[PDB]
Ligand binder design. Structure first.
Ligand SMILES: [K+]
Ligand SMILES: [K+]
Ligand SMILES: [K+]
Ligand SMILES: [K+]
Ligand SMILES: [K+]
Ligand SMILES: [K+]
Ligand SMILES: [K+]
Ligand SMILES: [K+]
Ligand SMILES: [K+]
Ligand SMILES: [K+]
Ligand SMILES: [K+]
Ligand SMILES: [K+]
Ligand SMILES: [K+]
Ligand SMILES: [K+]
Ligand SMILES: [K+]
Ligand SMILES: [K+]
Ligand SMILES: [K+]
Ligand SMILES: [K+]
Ligand SMILES: [K+]
Ligand SMILES: [K+]
Ligand SMILES: [K+]
Ligand SMILES: [K+]
Ligand SMILES: [K+]
Ligand SMILES: [Mg+2]
Ligand SMILES: [Mg+2]
Ligand SMILES: [Mg+2]
Ligand SMILES: [Mg+2]
Ligand SMILES: [Mg+2]
Ligand SMILES: [Mg+2]
Ligand SMILES: [Mg+2]
Ligand SMILES: [Mg+2]
Ligand SMILES: [Mg+2]
Ligand SMILES: [Mg+2]
Ligand SMILES: [Mg+2]
Ligand SMILES: [Mg+2]
Ligand SMILES: [Mg+2]
Ligand SMILES: [Mg+2]
Ligand SMILES: [Mg+2]
Ligand SMILES: [Mg+2]
Ligand SMILES: [Mg+2]
Ligand SMILES: [Mg+2]
Ligand SMILES: [Mg+2]
Ligand SMILES: [Mg+2]
Ligand SMILES: [Mg+2]
Ligand SMILES: [Mg+2]
Ligand SMILES: [Mg+2]
Ligand SMILES: [Mg+2]
Ligand SMILES: [Mg+2]
Ligand SMILES: [Mg+2]
Ligand SMILES: [Mg+2]
Ligand SMILES: [Mg+2]
Ligand SMILES: [Mg+2]
Ligand SMILES: [Mg+2]
Ligand SMILES: [Mg+2]
Ligand SMILES: [Mg+2]
Ligand SMILES: [Mg+2]
Ligand SMILES: [Mg+2]
Ligand SMILES: [Mg+2]
Ligand SMILES: [Mg+2]
Lengths: 259, 186, 183
RNA sequence: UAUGACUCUCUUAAGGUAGCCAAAUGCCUCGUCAUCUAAUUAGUGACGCGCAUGAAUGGAUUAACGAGAUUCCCACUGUCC
RNA sequence: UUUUUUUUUUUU
RNA sequence: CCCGUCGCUCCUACCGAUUGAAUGAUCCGGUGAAAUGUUCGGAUCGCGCGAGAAGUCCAUUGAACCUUAUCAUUUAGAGGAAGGAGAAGUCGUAACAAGGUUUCCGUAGGUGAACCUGCGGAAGGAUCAUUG
RNA sequence: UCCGCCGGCACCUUAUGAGAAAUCAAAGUUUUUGGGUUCCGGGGGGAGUAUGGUCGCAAGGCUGAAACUUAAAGGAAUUGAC
RNA sequence: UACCUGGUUGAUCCUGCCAGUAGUCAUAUGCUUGUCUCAAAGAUUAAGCCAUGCAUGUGUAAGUAUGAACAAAUUCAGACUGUGAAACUGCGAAUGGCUCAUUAAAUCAGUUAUAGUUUGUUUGAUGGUAUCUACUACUCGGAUAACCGUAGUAAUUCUAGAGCUAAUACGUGCAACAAACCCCGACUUCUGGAAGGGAUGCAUUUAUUAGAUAUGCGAUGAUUCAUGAUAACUCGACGGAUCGCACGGCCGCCGGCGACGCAUCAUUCAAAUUUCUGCCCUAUCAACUUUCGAUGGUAGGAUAGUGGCCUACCAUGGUGGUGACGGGUGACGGAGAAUUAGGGUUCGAUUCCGGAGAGGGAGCCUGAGAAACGGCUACCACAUCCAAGGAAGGCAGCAGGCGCGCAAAUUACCCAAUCCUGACACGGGGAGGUAGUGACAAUAAAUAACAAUACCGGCUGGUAAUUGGAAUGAGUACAAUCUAAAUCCCUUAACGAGGAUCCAUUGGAGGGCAAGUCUGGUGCCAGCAGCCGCGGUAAUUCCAGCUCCAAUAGCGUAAUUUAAGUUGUUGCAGUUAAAAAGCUCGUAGUUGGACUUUGGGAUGUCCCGUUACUUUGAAGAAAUUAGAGUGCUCAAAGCAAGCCUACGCUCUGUAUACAUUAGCAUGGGAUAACAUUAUAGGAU
């Protein structure tokens, strides 16, 4: 190609969007934004496919152009705006507040949240470095940049950000014994407590996480998101509490519900 | 145009490579600046990849040169080119390229020395006291003294005139100065 | 790109390896005549389905008993067979799947059930009724003799409410004869 | 169809084998075919009942050589226009 | 230990 | 039962003068459009200055063409010579019996044709055998 | 002369072995398939031919096709006929 | 889902192939063809050539209106504040679509790196010194389009003058005002401090300096890295002379919500280059590369950046039987497709990913992004028009035409769905969808069912162009429905079946292989026959009639898989069937004897150099494949959907598995590979 691609084929669209094979020849290509294309949920998908407020692309555009949907307390009129992990989507007209969280199967879910839980979010710190004039700053994995951060805060930590004031109100250091959620890989959407960390020079760090039921799984450092200090997450989790259920017991539960 | 690609080259085994695509704009090259010393300064503006800007010096007369031992940077005149390691013909042509050895006017550095150390190579009491205090650590290279005697100083160009459009550099000192003086004394 | 191209399809039967086995031909003709099939393709399709199911059951049986995959797939297959009536409750093991014959599947055809429950005087009469839209499974009219009737839906078979044998509005022949006799 | 592997015969002992060719050797003849040219009684290659080729009256070929006879091409030019 | 060549096509 | 020359029809390739031909890619040298940079140049336009066209100089990329040679894929050719196939052709009888000279291999020579002969070898011989 | 050991050219008997058998004490220990390793065959002709390369004084040696053609060719053994 | 059968003979057992049987999301062709649902479709030969039409344009309250454009108002005043064509300005056209020509460590797959670079845009943060003596900042200057009027030419979004008038166009310019740091520094109560002056925003360039960590000081495995300070430098496209809504508090000054725009960092969307391993046939290709870059070094130029990418000098290096180099490919690579005991064999032009091309080369402007071709420039090959002076070209885009061939569709409708794009909720989109042709391929499924009578075989069954009434879709058609509008499907008024003429075909009947020693004709003829064989006057085999057999809306005929243990690694052969070099040596290659810590007591636990290999983990696009759930009437499918009609609920579901080699991490130390051992220069 001679430049940037503006189209995204439906088959090439990420699987967790759950788009129909015969729905069309194209899928909404995520726009540039805080989150990566492969790890985001466009507002078009949220409004049309998930919440079913809009029955078509045109209805999605019409709804969004009325300034009725806010992301992180800011009105967004871009249909392909990339809304990703921990993002807050608020519709004042319907008095609806959602947080984007991975389900046990690794797919984005709009977990309903209270008005008090909708005023903040959690971000993961990438690195801390000095800017111009020697001013310290840190950048999160959602494209945010905060100046004059707490000196204790460092890379891979989590920060509680109050959106109304756009300020850090608390932070969690990345350490063993903290409840975390996996944001990537096959174990995406699982919730557990870190058991140990294996560090290899010039190579990815491994993190071992134990599920609330005792199940153990390992992942990479970049796929681990800290949700709280100790074992209590700072935010309300979706249904299932990040507990992955085997197909056998899932079928048992389905049959029990059937009968 | 000029290309930086490896398609035209031979394989490390010596075998020939068969073309499979045309030249690309992102691997292009451009003609050399061939900057020279002349009173008619000429710098051309080049629009490069991403909309950035480059400066091609066709002719330069003055340069920003630094005396490292005294930590003094002054804008002086470039007199001539004396030595060029890469190619001797560049010395004959007076080409201005990075790492080339040139001779620069010593007038600004002489003036700074006179004003700072009060030595040639009214005043208030505080000024003479300051000069006397500075005189304690006044150590000067005899070779640099002889160079100042002639009014010209040997310098090395540390910038790239064909990329930044400036022939900036530093005055030779110590072992480097001795090495280049030995190479020039022939 | 044409979006229709992404729709997939597959075959449902295979031709016999040896076209002219006399015993095979006799057995196939016997089954076709007994069950009122239009051609050997239907019998071969039923055989293909039975072979697929038996192969799946055999593959599962190869695995270790405590294998989660074996447990899950065997439970699914047994549930499917129980739903479609191939296996009874007492037949609650994968081994009884291997003991399934083409006759077991043929007995579940809507044509066979219609003939058996007494709505038709013969298998061919039943076929004609279903293809003429005189039969409904639940509240839905079914005109496919190959329709596989589930155990739950077996007892709901009844004449179509819009047909002469299930409701009113007799056929065009009867109406024409009545009009002719009216004079 | 044609010829004749084969058989028998006459003068005069035999009946041109291997080869080669319109040859410095062929009358017919500027033979026939291909090639070289715009055009070739020339050159080359091929064919052969060859007026009248043919085996130390030596047959066939042959690198290297030749003030030896021949044809063509490039360069060159007052040979010529 | 003299000499002794040959037998049309298909089929039974 | 069977071998070959010779005789007829057809098919497939092989050799071949023609210093054969075509196409593509590389090799040697030469010419070389256009564009770019550079030198000179100054129609003209604005306030002694600023901008600046045509044109010109030398370089860079370099199409295109010519010369030399080598590979790769095709293809024409007078004529020459092989193989194969085809119901009832001619001359012999070479191979199968000890096939009427046992057969066969290597090599050399010679005859219409199969083939004959010389030297050495094998049994796949027609002898598993003379302490006679 | 007699009794033994090692190595060698061979022979006779035998199948619990192999094999299509003829036969083989290695041609055995092979669908109960595997000790290590080199060469080499893929129906019969065309053909050990054409072409290229290489060796040779030559004769020829080594390497070595294809087009096309064909339902058999061939091995062991049985009966008869000769 | 581990399978064979006919054919050499008088007969037998073999080797061995030929033939048969089955498969192809495999092409083509022959015949036939009633219904429903899906659906490939000028790749193969020519990346050959193209008439004609279309496929890229774009407007918000928020850049620029005086159309001599429309409309409503104004009786008197009004710069304009409603629509606005045209035009300037900005953005886009580098996406998408098409094709597979070139290309054999090259593209490409997995796996790495940029501490070796660029990145319009989106998202989060950050913008302090310009005039300093001119002196608009209550706001600078000169043009030009549209418009109008003089036209040239045969002619083109070919083209010259003349008269106006705008900017978020162009060119300038105060740039609201400071502090701090550094240098010079008169003067001076002089180890001092001091007036004054210079420098000082952000950006660029070069130097000096700090950036520690066995009473302050960040990050990495790793950086003189991030960043700070100083000295200077640059004739800096930077540091807002822009626009829409509203309308307010103090005494003219302040004041909200936005739009657009410039600069820095981070982020996102990406590119470029890059680490390791991996590709078909060929030795009738064994040496190749190095004048003129080949391998490496030093210094430079160029590049966004690394690098012989290029220049100057220097050295002789670099690859190769572990197959370099050269050649062939009817060779784009992969995801995948066909067949499936296992191992394997064959295919992959084509909708997804990556690459390349726009008739063949080369060069280049614009732009964040192009070596762009529905952009330009030149040559070459073709080629349209001409008034003969010139001028215009690129369908391997959607249709369509010629040619080529065995071989492939309409010069239709639409932006309604999916999504892309622009100034933009609105325009455009031959991308994409709808419909037309369509027996590529796939799914379901009509052509009859039931009684009476007569015949038959044992109340029970079969046959009958005999009788009798019932049923229905193929067709036809109001209507509704569907649909962007149509059409089709589904539903359904009135019609629509007795030789139910509403008439089923394709191949065969000696064997393989199911089905006639029937009848007439021909007489080694004509012909059949994949193979074996039929036909010579009594032909189950030809040509026909009857009858019968296989499949069935399908069937026959003309590269590839299986069968093939006839390519054999699993797993073939070499005495006579084809086969072991005449014999020995011998380098590459392959292979290579034994030996080094076992046991009990107890109870996973306590006691006496480099690799192969194996266990586990992470990660490893979708689609396809396997597979869970789900009555599209069933099915191929699809990702739907279910209860009850609650102005709702199921947080509804949209799992899971597989994935060679190569890479990363982890446990084991049997079996193996390489190195080492003793002249002690050994350990401590
Ligand atoms: K005589
Ligand atoms: K002689
Ligand atoms: K002479
Ligand atoms: K015959
Ligand atoms: K003989
Ligand atoms: K013999
Ligand atoms: K003779
Ligand atoms: K296709
Ligand atoms: K425009
Ligand atoms: K653009
Ligand atoms: K790769
Ligand atoms: K530090
Ligand atoms: K590859
Ligand atoms: K570079
Ligand atoms: K270098
Ligand atoms: K490629
Ligand atoms: K742009
Ligand atoms: K077209
Ligand atoms: K649309
Ligand atoms: K048969
Ligand atoms: K007769
Ligand atoms: K007859
Ligand atoms: K027959
Ligand atoms: Mg594209
Ligand atoms: Mg003669
Ligand atoms: Mg002679
Ligand atoms: Mg005779
Ligand atoms: Mg004889
Ligand atoms: Mg004899
Ligand atoms: Mg004799
Ligand atoms: Mg053979
Ligand atoms: Mg098999
Ligand atoms: Mg026989
Ligand atoms: Mg091709
Ligand atoms: Mg590589
Ligand atoms: Mg950016
Ligand atoms: Mg630094
Ligand atoms: Mg360098
Ligand atoms: Mg190709
Ligand atoms: Mg492909
Ligand atoms: Mg195509
Ligand atoms: Mg593609
Ligand atoms: Mg291109
Ligand atoms: Mg073309
Ligand atoms: Mg072109
Ligand atoms: Mg181009
Ligand atoms: Mg294009
Ligand atoms: Mg085009
Ligand atoms: Mg076709
Ligand atoms: Mg079909
Ligand atoms: Mg019909
Ligand atoms: Mg039979
Ligand atoms: Mg007859
Ligand atoms: Mg017949
Ligand atoms: Mg074999
Ligand atoms: Mg023999
Ligand atoms: Mg043999
Ligand atoms: Mg031998
Ligand atoms: Mg040898």
């Amino acid at each position: 190609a001679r430049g940037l691609k503006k189209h995204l084929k439906r088959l090439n669209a990420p699987k967790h969007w759950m788009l129909d094979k015969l729905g069309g020849a194209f899928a909404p290509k995520p726009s540039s934004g805080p989150h990566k294309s492969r790890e985001c949920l466009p507002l078009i998908i949220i409004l049309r496919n998930r919440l079913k407020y809009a029955l078509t692309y045109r209805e999605v555009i019409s709804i969004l152009m009325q300034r009725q949907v806010m992301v992180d307390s800011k009105v967004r009129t871009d249909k392909t705006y990339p809304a990703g992990f921990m993002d807050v989507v608020s519709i004042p007209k319907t008095n609806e507040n959602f947080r984007l969280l991975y389900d046990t199967k690794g797919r984005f879910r709009l977990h309903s949240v209270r008005d008090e839980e909708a005023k903040f979010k959690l971000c993961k710190v990438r690195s801390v470095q000095f800017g111009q004039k020697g001013i310290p700053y840190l950048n999160t994995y959602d494209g945010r940049t905060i100046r004059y951060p707490d000196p204790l805060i460092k890379a891979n930590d989590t920060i509680k950000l109050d959106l109304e004031s756009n300020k850090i109100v608390d932070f969690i250091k990345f350490d063993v014994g903290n409840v975390v959620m996996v944001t990537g890989g096959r174990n995406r959407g699982r919730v557990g407590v870190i058991k140990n960390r294996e560090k290899h020079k010039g190579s990815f760090e491994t993190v071992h996480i134990q599920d609330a039921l005792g199940h153990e799984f390992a992942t990479r450092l970049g796929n681990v998101f800290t949700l709280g200090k100790g074992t209590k997450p700072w935010v309300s989790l979706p249904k299932g509490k990040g507990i992955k259920l085997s197909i056998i017991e899932e079928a048992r539960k389905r049959l029990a519900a059937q009968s | 145009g000029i290309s930086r690609d490896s398609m035209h080259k031979r394989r490390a085994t010596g075998g020939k490579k068969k073309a499979w695509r045309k030249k690309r704009k992102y691997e292009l090259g451009r003609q050399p600046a061939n900057t020279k010393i002349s009173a008619n300064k000429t710098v051309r503006r080049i629009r490069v990849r991403g909309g950035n800007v480059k400066w091609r010096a066709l002719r330069l007369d003055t340069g920003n040169y630094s005396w490292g031992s005294e930590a003094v940077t002054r804008k002086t005149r470039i007199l001539d080119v004396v030595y060029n390691a890469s190619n001797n013909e560049l010395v004959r042509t007076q080409t201005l390229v990075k790492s080339a050895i040139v001779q620069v006017d010593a007038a600004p550095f002489k003036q700074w020395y006179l004003q700072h150390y009060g030595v040639d190579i009214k005043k208030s009491n505080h000024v003479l006291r300051k000069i006397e205090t500075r005189q304690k650590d006044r150590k000067l290279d005899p070779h640099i003294e002889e160079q100042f005697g002639g009014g010209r100083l040997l310098a090395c160009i540390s910038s790239r005139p064909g990329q930044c459009g400036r022939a900036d550099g530093y005055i030779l000192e110590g072992k480097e100065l001795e090495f280049y003086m030995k190479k020039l004394q022939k | 790109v044409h979006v229709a191209f992404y729709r997939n399809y597959g075959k449902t039967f295979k031709k016999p390896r040896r076209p002219y086995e006399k015993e095979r031909l006799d057995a196939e003709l016997k089954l076709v005549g007994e069950y009122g099939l239009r051609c050997k393709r239907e019998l071969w399709r039923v055989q293909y389905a039975l072979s697929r199911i038996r192969n799946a059951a055999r593959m599962l049986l190869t695995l270790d008993e405590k294998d989660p995959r074996r447990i899950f797939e065997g439970e699914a297959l047994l549930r499917r067979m129980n739903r479609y009536g191939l296996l009874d409750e007492s037949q609650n093991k994968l081994d009884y799947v291997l003991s399934l014959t083409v006759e077991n599947f043929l007995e579940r055809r809507l044509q066979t059930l219609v003939f058996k429950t007494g709505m038709a005087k013969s298998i061919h009469h039943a076929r004609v009724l279903i293809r003429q839209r005189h039969i409904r499974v639940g509240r839905q009219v079914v005109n496919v003799p190959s329709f596989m009737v589930r155990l739950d839906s077996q007892k709901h078979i009844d004449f179509s409410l819009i047909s002469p044998f299930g409701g009113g509005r007799p056929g065009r022949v009867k109406r024409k004869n009545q009009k002719a006799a009216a004079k």
